Amino acid sequence: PYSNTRRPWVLRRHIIMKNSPTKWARKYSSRRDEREQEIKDDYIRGMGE
Amino acid sequence: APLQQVGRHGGPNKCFGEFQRVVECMTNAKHDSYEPCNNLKNDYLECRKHKVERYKAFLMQKHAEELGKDPEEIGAPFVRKRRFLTSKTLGLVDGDDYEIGVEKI
Amino acid sequence: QSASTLTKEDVLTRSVSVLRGFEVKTKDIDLQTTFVQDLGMDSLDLNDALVALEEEFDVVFDDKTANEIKTVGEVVDFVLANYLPTEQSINHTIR
Amino acid sequence: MIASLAGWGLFGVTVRAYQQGIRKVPFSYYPLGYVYSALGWVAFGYGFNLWTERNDKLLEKRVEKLKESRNLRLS
Amino acid sequence: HFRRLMQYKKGSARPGLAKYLNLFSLSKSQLIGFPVALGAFSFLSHSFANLQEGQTATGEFAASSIASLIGLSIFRTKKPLSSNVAIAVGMGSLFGFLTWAGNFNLGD
Amino acid sequence: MNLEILDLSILGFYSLISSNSFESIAILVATIMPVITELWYNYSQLFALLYTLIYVGAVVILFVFILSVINEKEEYEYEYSGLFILILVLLLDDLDDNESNDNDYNNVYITDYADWFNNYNESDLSVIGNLLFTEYALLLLIISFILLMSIIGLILIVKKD
Amino acid sequence: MDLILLMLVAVGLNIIDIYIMIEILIMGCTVNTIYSASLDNDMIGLIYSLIQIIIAGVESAIGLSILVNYNRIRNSEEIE
Amino acid sequence: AIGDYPVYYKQPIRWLSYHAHTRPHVFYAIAVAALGPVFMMATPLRRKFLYDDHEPLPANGYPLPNRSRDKTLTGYDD
Amino acid sequence: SSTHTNDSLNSSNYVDKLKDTHFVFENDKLPSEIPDVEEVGATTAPLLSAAYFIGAKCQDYNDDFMLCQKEAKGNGPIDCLKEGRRVTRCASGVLKDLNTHCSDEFRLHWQCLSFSNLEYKNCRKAESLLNKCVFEKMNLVKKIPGIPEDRQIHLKQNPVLKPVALHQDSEVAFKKAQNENSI
Amino acid sequence: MLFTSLLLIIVYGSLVNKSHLLTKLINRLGLIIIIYTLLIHLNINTLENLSIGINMFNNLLLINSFNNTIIELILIICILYVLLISFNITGLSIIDNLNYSKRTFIVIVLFNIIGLTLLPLVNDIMILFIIIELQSYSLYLLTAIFNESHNSTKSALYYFIVGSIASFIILDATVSIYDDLGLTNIQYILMYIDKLEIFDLLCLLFGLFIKIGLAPFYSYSITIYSLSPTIITNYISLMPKLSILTLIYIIMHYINIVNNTDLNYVISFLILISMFIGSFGGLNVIRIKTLLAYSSLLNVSYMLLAILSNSNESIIAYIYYIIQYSLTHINIFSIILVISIYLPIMNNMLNVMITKYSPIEYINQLKNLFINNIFIAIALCISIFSLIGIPPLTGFYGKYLVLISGLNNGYVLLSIVLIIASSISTVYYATILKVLSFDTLSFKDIISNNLIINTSPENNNNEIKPEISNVISYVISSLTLIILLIIIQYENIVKGAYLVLLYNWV
Amino acid sequence: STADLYGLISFTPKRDIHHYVIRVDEVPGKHFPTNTTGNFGNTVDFENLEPRRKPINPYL
Numbered sequence A: 001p002y003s004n005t006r007r008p009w010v011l012r013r014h015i016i017m018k019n020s021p022t023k024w025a026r027k028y029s030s031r032r033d034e035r036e037q038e039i040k041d042d043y044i045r046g047m048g049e
Numbered sequence B: 001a002p003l004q005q006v007g008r009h010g011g012p013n014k015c016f017g018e019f020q021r022v023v024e025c026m027t028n029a030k031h032d033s034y035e036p037c038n039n040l041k042n043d044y045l046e047c048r049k050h051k052v053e054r055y056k057a058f059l060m061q062k063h064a065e066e067l068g069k070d071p072e073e074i075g076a077p078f079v080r081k082r083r084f085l086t087s088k089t090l091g092l093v094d095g096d097d098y099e100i101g102v103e104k105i
Numbered sequence C: 001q002s003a004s005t006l007t008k009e010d011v012l013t014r015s016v017s018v019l020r021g022f023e024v025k026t027k028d029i030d031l032q033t034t035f036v037q038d039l040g041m042d043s044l045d046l047n048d049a050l051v052a053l054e055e056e057f058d059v060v061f062d063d064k065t066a067n068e069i070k071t072v073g074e075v076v077d078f079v080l081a082n083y084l085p086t087e088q089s090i091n092h093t094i095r
Numbered sequence D: 001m002i003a004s005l006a007g008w009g010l011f012g013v014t015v016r017a018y019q020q021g022i023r024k025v026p027f028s029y030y031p032l033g034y035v036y037s038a039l040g041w042v043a044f045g046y047g048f049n050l051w052t053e054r055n056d057k058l059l060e061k062r063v064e065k066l067k068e069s070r071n072l073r074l075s
Numbered sequence E: 001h002f003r004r005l006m007q008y009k010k011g012s013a014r015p016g017l018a019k020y021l022n023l024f025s026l027s028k029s030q031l032i033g034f035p036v037a038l039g040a041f042s043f044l045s046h047s048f049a050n051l052q053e054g055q056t057a058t059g060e061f062a063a064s065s066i067a068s069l070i071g072l073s074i075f076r077t078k079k080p081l082s083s084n085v086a087i088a089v090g091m092g093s094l095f096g097f098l099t100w101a102g103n104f105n106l107g108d
Numbered sequence F: 001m002n003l004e005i006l007d008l009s010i011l012g013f014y015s016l017i018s019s020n021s022f023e024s025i026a027i028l029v030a031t032i033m034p035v036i037t038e039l040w041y042n043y044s045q046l047f048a049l050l051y052t053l054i055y056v057g058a059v060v061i062l063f064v065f066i067l068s069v070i071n072e073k074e075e076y077e078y079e080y081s082g083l084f085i086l087i088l089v090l091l092l093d094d095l096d097d098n099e100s101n102d103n104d105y106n107n108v109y110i111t112d113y114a115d116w117f118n119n120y121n122e123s124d125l126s127v128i129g130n131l132l133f134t135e136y137a138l139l140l141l142i143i144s145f146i147l148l149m150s151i152i153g154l155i156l157i158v159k160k161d
Numbered sequence G: 001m002d003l004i005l006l007m008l009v010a011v012g013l014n015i016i017d018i019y020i021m022i023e024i025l026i027m028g029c030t031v032n033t034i035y036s037a038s039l040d041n042d043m044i045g046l047i048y049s050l051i052q053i054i055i056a057g058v059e060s061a062i063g064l065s066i067l068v069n070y071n072r073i074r075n076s077e078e079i080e
Numbered sequence H: 001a002i003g004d005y006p007v008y009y010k011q012p013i014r015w016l017s018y019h020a021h022t023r024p025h026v027f028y029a030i031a032v033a034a035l036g037p038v039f040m041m042a043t044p045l046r047r048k049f050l051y052d053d054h055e056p057l058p059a060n061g062y063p064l065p066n067r068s069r070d071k072t073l074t075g076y077d078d
Numbered sequence I: 001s002s003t004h005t006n007d008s009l010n011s012s013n014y015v016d017k018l019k020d021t022h023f024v025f026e027n028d029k030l031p032s033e034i035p036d037v038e039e040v041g042a043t044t045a046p047l048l049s050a051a052y053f054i055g056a057k058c059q060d061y062n063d064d065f066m067l068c069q070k071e072a073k074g075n076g077p078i079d080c081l082k083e084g085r086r087v088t089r090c091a092s093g094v095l096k097d098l099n100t101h102c103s104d105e106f107r108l109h110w111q112c113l114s115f116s117n118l119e120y121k122n123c124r125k126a127e128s129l130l131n132k133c134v135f136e137k138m139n140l141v142k143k144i145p146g147i148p149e150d151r152q153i154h155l156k157q158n159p160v161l162k163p164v165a166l167h168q169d170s171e172v173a174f175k176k177a178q179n180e181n182s183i
Numbered sequence J: 001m002l003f004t005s006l007l008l009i010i011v012y013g014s015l016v017n018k019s020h021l022l023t024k025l026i027n028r029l030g031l032i033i034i035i036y037t038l039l040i041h042l043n044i045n046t047l048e049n050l051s052i053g054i055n056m057f058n059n060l061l062l063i064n065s066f067n068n069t070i071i072e073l074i075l076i077i078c079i080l081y082v083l084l085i086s087f088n089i090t091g092l093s094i095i096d097n098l099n100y101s102k103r104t105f106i107v108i109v110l111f112n113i114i115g116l117t118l119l120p121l122v123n124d125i126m127i128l129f130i131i132i133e134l135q136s137y138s139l140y141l142l143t144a145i146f147n148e149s150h151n152s153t154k155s156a157l158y159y160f161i162v163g164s165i166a167s168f169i170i171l172d173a174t175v176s177i178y179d180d181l182g183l184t185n186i187q188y189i190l191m192y193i194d195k196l197e198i199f200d201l202l203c204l205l206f207g208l209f210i211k212i213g214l215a216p217f218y219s220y221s222i223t224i225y226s227l228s229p230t231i232i233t234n235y236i237s238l239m240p241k242l243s244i245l246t247l248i249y250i251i252m253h254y255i256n257i258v259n260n261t262d263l264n265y266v267i268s269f270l271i272l273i274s275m276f277i278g279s280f281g282g283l284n285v286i287r288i289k290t291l292l293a294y295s296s297l298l299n300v301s302y303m304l305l306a307i308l309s310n311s312n313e314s315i316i317a318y319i320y321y322i323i324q325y326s327l328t329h330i331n332i333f334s335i336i337l338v339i340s341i342y343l344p345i346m347n348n349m350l351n352v353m354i355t356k357y358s359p360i361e362y363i364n365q366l367k368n369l370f371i372n373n374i375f376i377a378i379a380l381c382i383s384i385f386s387l388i389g390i391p392p393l394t395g396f397y398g399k400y401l402v403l404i405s406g407l408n409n410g411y412v413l414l415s416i417v418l419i420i421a422s423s424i425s426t427v428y429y430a431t432i433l434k435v436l437s438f439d440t441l442s443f444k445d446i447i448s449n450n451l452i453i454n455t456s457p458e459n460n461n462n463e464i465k466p467e468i469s470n471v472i473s474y475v476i477s478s479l480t481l482i483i484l485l486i487i488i489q490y491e492n493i494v495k496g497a498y499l500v501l502l503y504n505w506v
Numbered sequence K: 001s002t003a004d005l006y007g008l009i010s011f012t013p014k015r016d017i018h019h020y021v022i023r024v025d026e027v028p029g030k031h032f033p034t035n036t037t038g039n040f041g042n043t044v045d046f047e048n049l050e051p052r053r054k055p056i057n058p059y060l
């Protein structure tokens, strides 16, 4: 069985429950995603050697 | 040392071994810096999220799209309804396409 | 929050407007305008005006004051001294 | 160390004397209070001296390792 | 601004809510002046930095004072011009001092 | 067809139009129910029942407090809103529902490989109790200490004498 | 839509409505913890989730008691 | 003192009688609760007089023999 | 334990709908460099009935396979392929013997388990006949390690917990052996 | 000692009859408990042994030399606070009986002391959430201990809501860290300090910044401190800062490992705003407790500059500043409670209403203190001049050490701003001194037979009856001279701060 | 002497992601409440554990 690992719909659609300092950073701030994309980019760049 | 990453049956889960090897590397006296343990940290984070492997899957799907390859020709067959895991799909000799019973085991 | 926001001029201005809705003799009303003589109010007409003035300022004249008030200015003085805002619920103030 | 404890006892007399002015009483009011106050801060002064003497020993031992660390940096 | 309008419509008979909404409320000129002043500040700060090959307190003083004056002329129309110049000089001097001190930290 | 989206949209619509305190406690019930049902499927059946066991008892105590405080304020206070603007607000919030911006993490599916090494299989609640009473017994005792403080705290705040 | 602080309109105009908002906000953190623990197959996170439920229940009781006494004080003459 | 409240440290037996008569919901609830730990302290007596404890259950995974692998093992080969 | 996972079938199709579960098949076999093996074809009930007979017959191969896993240092699935095939063949041999020597007794036992929620305590009569037949034809004895020989629960004469509903085939077969075998 | 003795006090208080005398004697029992707790803690915990750091209770708690010093400070300051409720502060029943009215006063304090001491020791995100709520809940109960007071219950309602939001932010930060890493122990998290979102720890600090009244969340703190009774404001405005600031220093110590410059700027931005509001905010106020609330905000900003730098000099600066500020905080509130006996009695314009909960509520109620009690007035003047930073008082060395850490780490902007803020705040500090003494020569030939102290009956007209009780006057005398005469022992005290190590070693 | 003393103490040694203090003295996982032998992913042998990093006590 292959399935998604996304958060519950209530966590990302409730008018109140989805608002927090960390959830806003995940949703609107690219600081986390830009840094984690480096690890993904390092994978391809380390093939040729 | 407190227990972390405990499986649903009281034992270590899938990613405890990665976490344990990180702790052993960090607390080992022979090391001068934490640089040798950097690769072990990536493996533990890869065990939980699989972000690099999902990225690899993203490239393969995108690469096949530009080549014109059909997803059903190079992918893996799958069934979306559990009641339709029929004996014909399972390859049984006398396998029929009638739905299987999943109401009450 | 719970404090009077009235002024002598505003109270007098609204007092005149209320008294001009009746059949008073004169429309020129000031502090020294007497109910009995200048306005020509009898026992029941005066009490009708006093209750009407009570409704405007959300105040209640006591028995002694209402049975001895003579001029409009005394009504103005009573309203200024005794008026209070009605207490609100807990949600109105702290929220 | 007697001079040190004499100073601490002098400080205790000052605290009691300053207390008398706060309470608005003559400075001779209940003279036994100065004896209690002086001995209280003498006990604090005896403990304070042990704290400082102990701290001097600890500082010297740490300084030795700090000098070794500085020598590696200056090389 | 639109969200705060909904809060006004959610209830207008509660004095406590109205008092705090009035403090955060901005006039129409402010809603227009503020983005223009900040936008002008961003442009002039970057434009002056490129001229000098680096950020200086002189450029930040000029960028802050001019941008503040541009903004002040929008939402502070009912004031003397010299009054807006004095505030623009004051605002520009503060950010010039900010750059002179090395922003929030000297770093390396 | 994810019907959880429709339920949350209905719940969100009434949140913006709720006026009295009774409609607010009804919002709370209309919030726990989607949480419990979405927990009952997918992730964790154990905590779906735990949420029902604990929060439903809190709701009733919350409700009985409302009966002692309602003071006619919202039975005649006017609200303006507007049907068009309320739908526009909900429509714009519906546009963005991606809580995370790791597209690979959200679009690529993963599987786990089961193993037979755990011949001793028990429920997750037993493992939680095994660790809570042995590994983290201090947390359990401090929680009881907090519960003791609440019992004393409630009495001193509420009791007249 | 979150950055314009849209949730400030979804909260009602009563003191008890603020209490309900806090319970929902804390409940969102617990749901997230259960989401992470279930994926990781980590019972430590489920221990954290249970603690968050118990602690949040204590918070509601203390806040309600303060609000109960606050409402009591205004209606406290009781001359009758 | 025909019906006085006994002092616990002076008449412990009479003090217990007061609560057993006037507060039955307290005296006997504690009495039932006390027997729990009491039986727990009597466990060593049962360990020596009645029977011994059971062998611990093999709830720790597969029992691995504490020895090196047998390199001389064959059979069922390819 | 009915906790939902990503490794097996969940409780209901609503869980699949929320997870968007795809039941994925692979049409590729093991590479030719790995020698082929014949997989065990016994279902749950026969395996539970023959669990102690597989352990008795294939104890050294079970231990060797498990010792390979521990000594592989994380590379168990790949390194211990050779040891895995020994266990599969040995386990298959036990089931093959049960179908050639004790088929009537073997089938009586695991059909009782299917009739009684797969609980050992509810099929003592059928198990006793099976245990006797296996010992007399295969020299294999059920043993529960860690306890004295006479304190084994399957040999208990008067168990506290007994099946609610008797299995008629087990009752008839048990009586046929009581009078005949023990004259 | 604390936990075991607390249970005994809880049962004993509910058994004995309700009376003011028994409550006061029970308060003295709580004083003995804290004194015994201090003796036990000093017997087993030493600075040298704890330098490395020792884990406790399955690594859920971690105690080091830095943590141990604050715990000893917390116990000592709590001892001085219990003296207020364990003894007379004015000697008048109409005033002093408020402290003896609530029996659970000592019980709630003992609950909070356990939370205060354990908070800097937290080594797990789970126990961090548990302890921070244990401390927060105890503060709400103490704020609402006078449940017959409209302001006390209103403040506690405000305190509960603001703190609960901060607790949610703290919980939200810890949960987000668990999602990224899957670990709950801080030391395990430190292994991945370079691979977790470091701004999630900034979310954790934001929740902690709310609980200490930092800007822009300052508003609720000023409102609560002014409305709450002086005996309650004295505790809730100082004790939470003793533990949370220590925990913030530890968290900032871990954050500086990766040295995120963006993280420092955000904290610098909040410190800059707090100095502006802390200085200009108190310029136009008429309440003394409102003035002290702005003073509290400004001084916390000064300590946060040392915390933000997080260097060897920061340990010396923070430890010294927190100790001397607490002593000054106790001294000022001790004097405020006592001097209520010099208030004139009416026998009116502005219809000023003064309640029994806060007898001293306005700055001008301190008028003619130079004449009423010259020794108490000078003691207040010494304390105020310490807050200003006049050398060689304790306050100057606190700001002197903070400036050293700030300028050494390159915070030139904050160091200059903190000195401009100090000059601005001197204006309202000097206003207190103006009220005390600037009218002495005109009111020297005045008659005051209407003061509160004048209502106290005399014993025999021959006994020399002091106006102030022995205990509270002695505490003021001791604290005043320690602030004044710190130059005598300043060198040795800093040497003690030299030995307080947070994983420095070498 | 005083200037030399203050220079030693006031010097803050550089910390980075390669050199910092972690207060863990043992490797976890030697014993689990149940099912200690899982998928054999625990490769850390406690019978041949190398000496752990020890904390430095400058006063000893």
Ligand SMILES: CCCCCCCCCCCCCCCCCC(=O)OC[C@H](COP(=O)(O)OCCN)OC(=O)CCCCCCCCCCCCCCCCC
Residues within 6 Å of the ligand: E022, E023, E024, E025, E094, E095, E097, E098, J215, J216, J272, J273, J276, J277, J417
């Ligand atoms: C867009 C969202 C809202 C903006 C963010 C606000 C929150 C962050 C600011 C931190 C301070 C929080 C202050 C409380 C929040 C402000 C709420 C507010 O906007 O109220 C407006 C207030 C009243 O304005 P008023 O004109 O009297 O009423 C309007 C009626 N038409 O007007 C005010 O007085 C508010 C200003 C308070 C003073 C803050 C000053 C901070 C320090 C600034 C200078 C920095 C000091 C260092 C300078 C040198 C630096 C190098």
Ligand SMILES: CCCCCCCCCCCCCCCCCC(=O)OC[C@H](COP(=O)(O)OCCN)OC(=O)CCCCCCCCCCCCCCCCC
Residues within 6 Å of the ligand: F007, F008, F010, F011, F014, F017, F019, F022, F023, F026, F027, F029, F030, F031, F033, F034
């Ligand atoms: C469960 C089956 C039996 C119940 C079915 C009742 C259906 C009514 C709507 C159920 C709640 C859906 C979500 C809405 C949140 C609560 C909002 C509310 O106050 O109830 C809606 C009801 C509609 O009447 P209306 O006049 O439009 O609203 C007042 C306008 N000033 O206005 C009212 O105040 C009437 C309230 C009646 C009592 C309802 C108590 C709450 C019921 C919750 C049980 C279902 C749980 C939520 C399921 C949907 C989740 C989105």
Ligand SMILES: CCCCCCCCCCCCCCCCCC(=O)OC[C@H](COP(=O)(O)OCCN)OC(=O)CCCCCCCCCCCCCCCCC
Residues within 6 Å of the ligand: E087, E090, E094, J272, J275, J276, J279, J417, J420, J421
């Ligand atoms: C030689 C010795 C020198 C010693 C002194 C050195 C410093 C001198 C400072 C000079 C500037 C202040 C003097 C002039 C200001 C006069 C203020 C004023 O006239 O009114 C206030 C003004 C609004 O004007 P209005 O109230 O209408 O008055 C009628 C004017 N026709 O209100 C305003 O518009 C002012 C602008 C709004 C407030 C801005 C605040 C931002 C921060 C300002 C700097 C504060 C820095 C503090 C740093 C520590 C705290 C962070």
Ligand SMILES: CCCCCCCCCCCC(=O)OC[C@H](COP(=O)(O)OCC[N+](C)(C)C)OC(=O)CCCCCCCCCCC
Residues within 6 Å of the ligand: D003, D004, D005, D007, D008, D009, D010, D011, D014, D017, D018, D045, J481, J482, J485, J486, J487, J488, J489, J490, J491, J492
């Ligand atoms: C009406 C009153 C007005 C004011 C009058 C003032 C008179 C002063 C009295 C004389 C005092 C005296 O003689 O002090 C001398 C003694 C003995 O010094 P030592 O043991 O050698 O210490 C070494 C001194 N070095 C370093 C200068 C060599 O020090 C004391 O006891 C100090 C008293 C405590 C001061 C407060 C700071 C320390 C607090 C510790 C806990 C935080």
Ligand SMILES: CCCCCCCCCCCC(=O)OC[C@H](COP(=O)(O)OCC[N+](C)(C)C)OC(=O)CCCCCCCCCCC
Residues within 6 Å of the ligand: D029, D030, D032, D033, D034, D036, D037, D038, D039, D040, D041, D043, D044, J470, J474
């Ligand atoms: C070994 C260390 C401790 C010192 C030994 C003495 C302890 C106190 C017991 C004596 C009895 C007593 O305190 O009696 C109470 C006295 C007198 O008070 P009064 O106002 O005159 O009472 C009025 C009585 N008439 C009517 C007879 C006049 O108070 C004092 O003198 C206050 C000073 C307390 C002692 C000093 C403590 C210093 C601690 C500071 C260190 C940090």
